[PDB]
């Protein structure tokens, strides 16, 4: 039933970014009144984004995420550049961000006033990503139970903040910056918390049967998310000063330290567990992209393989993991959120541009859902708006990111398009492959 569909999507969208990003939107919006408007604007942008992905998630329907659509709309090089961006920028940086929020909140009760030491925050971020890489390598039968449990902690912590906010009101604004430059960085920080819908929204079609009911699940659910995000920000703004909320790397622990008295055992624990759940989820659900990317021939044959006694995709986890652990070289959490956001929204731009170009190029391709063109023609321009400002508001992050993208052209030619013929090269590639196979004990999946 539709009511139980909404209970799947809202619990999928809510994420862990809501525990990072309040400080982010407040830093750029200057004062609470405009921060709440940005939270709403991020909601509305997600409603328009999600319904476009309800279309792509039912017209093309090929498994594996956006890359599966790029094979139809572009093929060849742009399909590889989506896979390359998603594995070296998007999926690493959003894991490191959630691993680092975990680390700051787990440590913050030892450092109540003064900021938690970055050299320690980065090690405890790493210890979390390696421990959850090991658990996903040892057992899908265990790592599923670790995902099943902590989805409760996500909503328990976030509801507790709101009910504490209500008793604060029961006992009981200007927008001081307005530069288009900063308001795009406010939008990036607020949009990060909604950032589930492009990966997974199609899952609900396997239990909500009519194709017109999938838009109803979106249009009901994302206002519910927006309500929760606005209410949690009101819980902060009715308890904390702007001069406090900009100072703390873990704002909900400040709020928890004010109300609870038992503070150490509540908000740090329940929020920490939600982020331990979100890092786990991003590892567990990663394999799909490697299997698809190697099956369709863009990605090296070793990254398809599985350890046959445990049925866990060992080389793909170890590559996922080591990319996440290199983001420990970054300076600051909101630096990485800006970086992630640029390439995430630039990928969604290529997808929704693609959908309109496909509606033009192949008309009436049996579409179960067909949205009004008036939605994408605002939304594509909104993706372009964010990117176009960000080129000059945050140049250096885009520069190192486009350096990653351009470094994909060599490995596309060498690995896929030029198909370099020398027998010594092929025997070297084979030798490198069987070394990894022997050193991890891994074998191909059933074709």
């Amino acid at each position: 039933t539709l009511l139980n569909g909404v209970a799947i999507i809202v619990g999928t969208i809510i994420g862990s970014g809501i525990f990072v990003t309040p400080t982010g939107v407040l830093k750029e919006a200057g004062s609470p009144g405009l921060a709440l408007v940005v939270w709403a604007a991020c909601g509305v942008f997600s409603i328009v984004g999600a319904l476009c992905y309800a279309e792509l998630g039912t017209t093309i329907s090929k498994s594996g995420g956006d890359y599966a659509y790029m094979l139809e709309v572009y093929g060849s090089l742009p399909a590889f550049l989506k896979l390359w961006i998603e594995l070296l920028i998007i999926r690493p940086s959003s894991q490191y961000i959630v691993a680092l929020v975990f680390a700051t909140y787990l440590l913050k009760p030892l450092f109540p006033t003064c900021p938690v030491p970055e050299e320690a925050a980065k090690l405890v971020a790493c210890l979390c990503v390696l421990l959850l890489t090991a658990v996903n390598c040892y057992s899908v039968k265990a790592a599923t139970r670790v995902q099943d449990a902590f989805a409760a902690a996500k909503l328990l912590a976030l509801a507790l903040i709101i009910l504490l906010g209500f008793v604060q009101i029961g006992k009981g604004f200007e927008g001081t910056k307005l530069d288009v430059g900063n308001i795009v960085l406010a939008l990036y920080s607020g949009l990060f918390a909604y950032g589930g819908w492009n990966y997974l929204n199609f899952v609900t079609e396997e239990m909500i049967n009519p194709y017109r009911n999938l838009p109803l699940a979106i249009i009901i659910s994302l206002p519910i998310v927006t309500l929760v995000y606005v209410l949690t920000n009101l819980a902060y703004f009715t308890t904390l000063s702007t001069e406090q909320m900009l100072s703390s790397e873990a704002v909900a622990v400040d709020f928890g330290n004010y109300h609870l008295g038992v503070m150490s055992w509540i908000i740090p624990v329940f929020v920490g567990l939600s982020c331990f759940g979100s890092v786990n989820g991003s590892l567990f659900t990663s394999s799909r992209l490697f299997f698809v990317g190697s099956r369709e021939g863009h990605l090296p044959s070793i990254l398809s393989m599985i350890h046959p006694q445990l049925l866990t995709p060992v080389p793909s986890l170890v590559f996922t993991c080591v990319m996440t652990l290199l983001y420990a070289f970054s300076k600051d959490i909101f630096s990485v959120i800006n970086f992630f956001s640029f390439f995430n929204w630039l990928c969604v731009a290529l997808a929704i541009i693609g959908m309109i170009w496909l509606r033009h190029r192949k008309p009436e391709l049996e579409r179960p859902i067909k949205v009004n063109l008036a939605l994408p023609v605002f939304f594509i321009l909104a993706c372009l708006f964010l990117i176009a400002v960000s080129f000059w508001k945050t140049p250096v992050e885009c520069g190192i990111g486009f350096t990653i993208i351009l470094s994909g052209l060599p490995v596309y030619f060498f690995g896929v398009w030029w198909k370099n013929k020398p027998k010594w090269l092929l025997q070297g590639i084979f030798s490198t492959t069987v070394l990894c196979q022997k050193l991890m004990q891994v074998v191909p999946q059933e074709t």
Partner: protein
């Protein structure tokens, strides 16, 4: 593609790869407990906040 299951089940000769894979699996947990000890050292010797 690559070496298949039906080959690899006899290429795992115990004096080489099986002892090697035991050693690397121990080296990972030794190294991760090293990083846990490193993090606990930093949190112990970093200066504690003055109380308000």
């Amino acid at each position: 593609t690559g070496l298949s299951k039906e080959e690899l089940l006899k290429v795992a000769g115990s004096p080489g790869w099986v002892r090697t894979r035991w050693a690397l699996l121990l080296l990972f947990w030794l190294g991760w407990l090293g990083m846990l000890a490193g993090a606990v050292v930093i949190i112990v010797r970093a200066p504690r906040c003055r109380e308000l």
